Amino acid sequence: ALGKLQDVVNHNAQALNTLVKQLSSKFGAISSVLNDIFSRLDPPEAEVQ
Amino acid sequence: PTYGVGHQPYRVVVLSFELLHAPATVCGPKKSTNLVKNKCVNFNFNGLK
Amino acid sequence: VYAWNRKRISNCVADYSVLYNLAPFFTFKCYGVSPTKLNDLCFTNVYADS
């Protein structure tokens, strides 16, 4: 019965958790951690990563 | 010793590294400091900054 | 060349800076890591092939 409200509570969660899952993607880079990129590579080549 | 630089002998050393999920055993000369807890500090662990 | 000497260097403190005075280094190229900033990363087991 109280579903139309629960959906508003559910989708918002799917709007946040998924937005968190996007932080684990590399987007074509070597990793998803900026510290590991800054420590291994130098800025001249870390800019493109 | 009379040939050109293109034919001169060159000593070459290849240092191959390994980054696995294991207690690291070879790093550089960085003095370790004390562990101060409950304070926002800059942590600089073996492979995590 | 066909019998390049491979040695496992474990449980050490790798100070690459001393490698610049005991032997004059020419073009130095590192793949995967930068030439500098090698004193703040601790590897697990390194291998020297000479």
From Swiss-Prot, chain B:
Full protein name: Spike protein S1
Species of provenance: Severe acute respiratory syndrome coronavirus 2
Subunit field text: Binds to host ACE2. RBD also interacts with the N-linked glycan on 'Asn-90' of ACE2. Cleavage of S generates a polybasic C-terminal sequence on S1 that binds to host Neuropilin-1 (NRP1) and Neuropilin-2 (NRP2) receptors. Interacts with host integrin alpha-5/beta-1 (ITGA5:ITGB1) and with ACE2 in complex with integrin alpha-5/beta-1 (ITGA5:ITGB1). May interact via cytoplasmic c-terminus with M protein. May interact (via N-terminus) with host bilirubin and biliverdin, thereby preventing antibody binding to the SARS-CoV-2 spike NTD via an allosteric mechanism.
Positions of the UniProt region annotated as Disordered: 21-43
Task performed by this protein: Attaches the virion to the cell membrane by interacting with host receptor, initiating the infection. The major receptor is host ACE2. When S2/S2' has been cleaved, binding to the receptor triggers direct fusion at the cell membrane. When S2/S2' has not been cleaved, binding to the receptor results in internalization of the virus by endocytosis using host TFRC and GRM2 and leading to fusion of the virion membrane with the host endosomal membrane. Alternatively, may use NRP1/NRP2 and integrin as entry receptors.
From Swiss-Prot, chain C:
Protein name listed in UniProt: Spike protein S1
Organism: Severe acute respiratory syndrome coronavirus 2 (2019-nCoV)
Lineage: Viruses, Riboviria, Orthornavirae, Pisuviricota, Pisoniviricetes
Domain of life: Viruses
Subunit structure comment from the entry: Binds to host ACE2. RBD also interacts with the N-linked glycan on 'Asn-90' of ACE2. Cleavage of S generates a polybasic C-terminal sequence on S1 that binds to host Neuropilin-1 (NRP1) and Neuropilin-2 (NRP2) receptors. Interacts with host integrin alpha-5/beta-1 (ITGA5:ITGB1) and with ACE2 in complex with integrin alpha-5/beta-1 (ITGA5:ITGB1). May interact via cytoplasmic c-terminus with M protein. May interact (via N-terminus) with host bilirubin and biliverdin, thereby preventing antibody binding to the SARS-CoV-2 spike NTD via an allosteric mechanism.
Designated gene of the protein: S
Effect of residue 27 to A: In strain: Omicron/BA.2, Omicron/BA.2.12.1, Omicron/BA.4, Omicron/BA.5, Omicron/BQ.1.1, Omicron/XBB.1.5, Omicron/EG.5.1
Role summary: Attaches the virion to the cell membrane by interacting with host receptor, initiating the infection. The major receptor is host ACE2. When S2/S2' has been cleaved, binding to the receptor triggers direct fusion at the cell membrane. When S2/S2' has not been cleaved, binding to the receptor results in internalization of the virus by endocytosis using host TFRC and GRM2 and leading to fusion of the virion membrane with the host endosomal membrane. Alternatively, may use NRP1/NRP2 and integrin as entry receptors.
